[PDB]
């Protein structure tokens, strides 16, 4: 069996692995959320435009109808 000190750097290696994983997933989550927020707000804007012209189409249809 290994001694206590070698186990100390064993657990330190595991902690450094977990910290490196956490930092790189943090950076990946940051770029992911930037891209996701930008794209989702762009499609929400075109959603708003589509429903605006769609509402124009409904009001034109109902207007001409009850004429």
């Amino acid at each position: 069996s290994p001694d206590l000190s070698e186990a100390m750097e064993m657990m330190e290696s595991q902690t450094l692995l977990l910290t490196l994983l956490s930092v790189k997933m943090e950076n990946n989550l940051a770029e992911f959320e930037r891209r996701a927020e930008k794209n989702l707000l762009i499609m929400c804007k075109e959603k708003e435009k589509l429903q605006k012209k769609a509402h124009e189409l409904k009001r034109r249809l109902l207007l001409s109808q009850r004429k």
């Binding site: 100390m8 330190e12 956490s22 997933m25 989702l40």
Partner: protein
């Protein structure tokens, strides 16, 4: 970025205490699992 940069004076010291090392490793594992499940939940939220 979000965390303080004060960990460098923690990791440069030769590890001596078993309880501290076990607690710190368990905390790091909990942090990894926590960010893993949060990234998962963000992924399915984005998908739906």
């Amino acid at each position: 970025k979000n965390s303080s940069h004060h960990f460098v004076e923690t990791f440069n010291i030769k590890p001596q205490d078993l309880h501290k090392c076990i607690a710190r490793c368990h905390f790091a594992r909990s942090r990894f699992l926590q960010i893993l499940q949060r990234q998962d939940c963000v992924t399915q939220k984005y998908q739906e």
